[PDB]
């Protein structure tokens, strides 16, 4: 037979991959960072509070201008916010109320959303009629849509629960590339700053680094226990951080092929719903099901603050491109700006 | 001017507030079944790529049937966005004795979920007339064990089928389980669901008011 040989071949490939990592695992990030100054107690205050959503807020994204913001809710509406003056710029009603993700175009002319309807809808924001209308529906996924991130004005990457990720052409409306290789449903996604690679977390305790141009998986990272529901990319673009249901966060590197630091404590037993980084990469913010949001010293793993003030589980979390504010949504139908 | 943009924001709030009244009286029902259960014909008698929500109204009360198709087999915590529903409607084929064992497992996995706690259950034993014809000529002892009743009595078999469903709950003492032996009657199906969700809310008010 040959399946037994292939199983044997797969058995010995993993040994050589571990040995290659183990040989290069000469030290740890903690040992090198045993002589740097601690950041101290971070204190943040709720500057603004955005009211108007009628149900649980599932997704939220920041505009590149660092002033506008979009949010989604179980009610089935999309609201564009002016974070400075708490002004509702737009209010987009959706066809389906089961929407689990939303994205903002880098140029600002489009927004995207999707969910348990297995499709992604693109909305034109700058029309001559003075309204907001859907531009194109992107069908081709067999599971529910779990994440989407605009590449360009004519390109978007979507991940679904059918264990795959895809790259689309909005003008044509057809799936250009399909990324296969996962085992469980993909829950997260994170575009690189250069926008040429991306990473995805799935419900199999595995994160894979992909290549949009080539359509093939470059790297694979393991070490978690439960499903990974939050992934973010380091500002340098050479690392990323995960967050899983086992109440732990880890920092992986694309070059060392290894986990570097672990962000867990004995007083936390609930999972992580969202993960975000700071403009300089020195802080790591993560939402939790314990109704709070935690700030971690990314270079020291020491907790350094708590963003408390929400009355339910924190779902969303984002940092502006200029590093001046943090927005967090939660199941109590409120958004809060923290400075 | 920035003062004319503030009036646009306040005009949006007036439209949002007009929907707050509707969502405060909305009742969501999650519908489950199978291909032979009769979910297609059941919805045909209701005068209304993923989930097919059917918004309608009974006795000036808004209703919404979240009818997932075959997607209900998904078994992740993310898929449990239905933690805000008030009841779960389950369609079961009584005539199909062979698949009753199969239909008895998916019931066990859903109702015992840690998310669907504080949610009531409604059971609709569909095609009862076919069961009447199927029994009195075909025994159920050849398909099921631990059946001490008479296999040629409709009331004896019916009293056994419901007990098989009721014994697969490890969280019984939190919420009730209603059962109906419905058919293609086409008329009472909307009224039977109305009473079950009326008493579900009533038994939520009685604890919230400290009246019981």
């Amino acid at each position: 037979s040959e399946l037994d040989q292939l199983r044997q071949e797969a058995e010995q490939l993993k040994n050589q991959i571990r040995d290659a990592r183990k040989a290069c695992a000469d030290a740890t990030l903690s040992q090198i960072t045993n002589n740097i100054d601690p950041v101290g107690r971070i204190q943040m205050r709720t500057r603004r509070t955005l009211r108007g959503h009628l149900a649980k807020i599932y997704a939220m994204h920041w505009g590149t201008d660092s002033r506008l913001l979009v949010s989604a809710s179980q009610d089935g509406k999309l609201i564009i916010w002016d974070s400075y003056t708490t002004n509702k710029v737009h209010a987009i009603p959706l066809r389906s109320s089961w929407v689990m993700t939303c994205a903002y175009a880098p140029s600002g002319n489009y927004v995207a959303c999707g969910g348990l309807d297995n499709i992604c809808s693109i909305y034109n924001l700058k029309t001559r009629e003075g309204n907001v209308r859907v531009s194109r529906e992107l069908a081709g996924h067999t599971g529910y849509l779990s994440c989407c991130r605009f590449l360009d004005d004519n390109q978007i990457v979507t991940s679904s629960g059918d264990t795959t990720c895809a790259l689309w052409d909005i003008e044509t409306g057809q799936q250009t590339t399909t990324f296969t290789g996962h085992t469980g449903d993909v829950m997260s996604l994170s575009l690189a700053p250069d926008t040429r690679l991306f990473v995805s977390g799935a419900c199999d305790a595995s994160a894979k680094l992909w290549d949009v141009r080539e359509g093939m998986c470059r790297q694979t990272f393991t070490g978690h226990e439960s499903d990974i529901n939050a992934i973010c990319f380091f500002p340098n673009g050479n690392a990323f951080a995960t967050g899983s249901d086992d109440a732990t966060c880890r920092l992986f590197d694309l070059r060392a092929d290894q986990e570097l630091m672990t962000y867990s404590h004995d007083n936390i037993i609930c999972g992580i719903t969202s993960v975000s980084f700071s403009k300089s990469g020195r802080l790591l913010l993560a939402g939790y099901d314990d109704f709070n949001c935690n700030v971690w010293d990314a270079l020291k793993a020491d907790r350094a603050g708590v963003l408390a003030g929400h009355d339910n589980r924190v779902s969303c979390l984002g940092v502006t491109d200029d590093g001046m504010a943090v927005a967090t949504g939660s199941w109590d139908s409120f958004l809060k700006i923290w400075n | 001017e920035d003062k004319a943009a503030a009036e646009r924001s306040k005009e949006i709030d007036k439209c949002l507030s007009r929907e707050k009244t509707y969502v405060k009286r909305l009742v969501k029902i999650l519908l489950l079944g199978a291909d032979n259960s009769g979910k297609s014909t059941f919805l045909k008698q209701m005068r209304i790529k993923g989930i097919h929500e059917y918004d309608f109204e009974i006795k000036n009360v808004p209703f919404k049937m979240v009818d997932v198709g075959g997607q209900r087999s998904e078994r992740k915590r993310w898929f449990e966005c239905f933690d805000s529903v008030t009841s779960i409607l389950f369609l079961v084929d009584s005539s199909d004795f062979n698949r009753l064992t199969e239909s008895l497992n998916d019931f066990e996995t859903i109702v015992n979920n840690r998310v669907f706690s504080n949610v009531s259950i409604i059971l609709f034993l569909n095609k009862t007339d076919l069961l009447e014809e199927k029994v009195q000529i075909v025994s159920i002892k050849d398909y099921f064990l631990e059946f001490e009743g008479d296999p040629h009595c409709l009331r004896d078999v019916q009293k056994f089928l419901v007990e098989c469903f009721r014994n697969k709950r490890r969280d019984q003492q939190q919420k009730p389980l209603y059962h109906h032996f419905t058919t293609a009657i086409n008329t009472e199906n909307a009224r039977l669901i109305f009473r079950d969700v009326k008493d579900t809310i009533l038994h939520d008010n009685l604890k919230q008011l400290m009246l019981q």
Partner: single-chain antibody
């Protein structure tokens, strides 16, 4: 996409005339509309305003009391009512749509205009450029100034530029003194700091002839500068 106004005609002093404007091709319920008049040989003059939902209404100091502006959103129409028509009301009336949110471009689309003949403080916005002769293919600059500083605390400078081609309705070129309207070639640019403003054309063409106006939106008694004719 269409803004057709009608209802004008010859009238006697002291008589009443009603102006109606019909919109078709856009979400009329979310646009605040304006009335702008133009004397038979002089520049434009703002008249009235009605918000979206008819929340706030503003009038010119010369027509307050005699003029009333109302809208009928379901019928997609806008109305102007005049009761005591004097001899200074002989002009051409335009209708302008405008929407206000963060990043919008108001005054983008103007109507077609209806004529009316009668047989019988605030920022002063200046333009000492009555006539200028040009040659196609060259670069020109149009200068302007205001009594007060148009720069606001929120960083927005409210100065607009308009172009009226011979026998054509005015069109928007630059809004908020730095932003280029959609559908306008890149050769048009604007500058200025808080009091003196200039519109620059890189390469001239045959369609650049006409009269260039400008406007302020800082205080609602809106004022237009005098015309600037490109003689060519």
């Amino acid at each position: 996409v269409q803004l057709v106004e009608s209802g004008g005609g010859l009238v006697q002093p002291g008589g009443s005339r009603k102006l109606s404007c019909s919109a078709s091709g856009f979400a009329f319920s979310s646009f605040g509309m304006h009335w702008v008049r133009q004397a038979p040989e002089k520049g434009l003059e703002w008249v009235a305003y009605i918000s979206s939902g008819s929340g706030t209404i503003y009038y010119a100091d010369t027509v307050k009391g005699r003029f009333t502006i109302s809208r009928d959103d379901p019928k997609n129409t806008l109305f102007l009512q005049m009761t005591s028509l004097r001899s200074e009301d002989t002009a051409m009336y335009y209708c302008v749509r405008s929407i206000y949110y963060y990043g919008s471009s108001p005054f983008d689309f103007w109507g077609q205009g209806t004529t009316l003949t009668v047989s019988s403080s605030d920022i002063v916005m200046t333009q000492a450029t009555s006539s200028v002769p040009v040659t196609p293919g060259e670069s020109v600059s149009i200068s302007c100034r205001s009594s007060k500083s148009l720069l606001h605390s929120n960083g927005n400078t409210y100065l607009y530029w308009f172009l009226q081609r011979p026998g054509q309705s005015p069109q928007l070129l630059i809004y908020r003194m730095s932003n280029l309207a959609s559908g306008v070639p890149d050769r048009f640019s604007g500058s200025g700091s808080g009091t003196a403003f200039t519109l620059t054309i890189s390469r001239l063409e045959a369609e650049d002839v006409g009269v260039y106006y400008c406007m302020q939106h800082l205080e609602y008694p809106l004022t237009f500068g005098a015309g600037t004719k490109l003689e060519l």
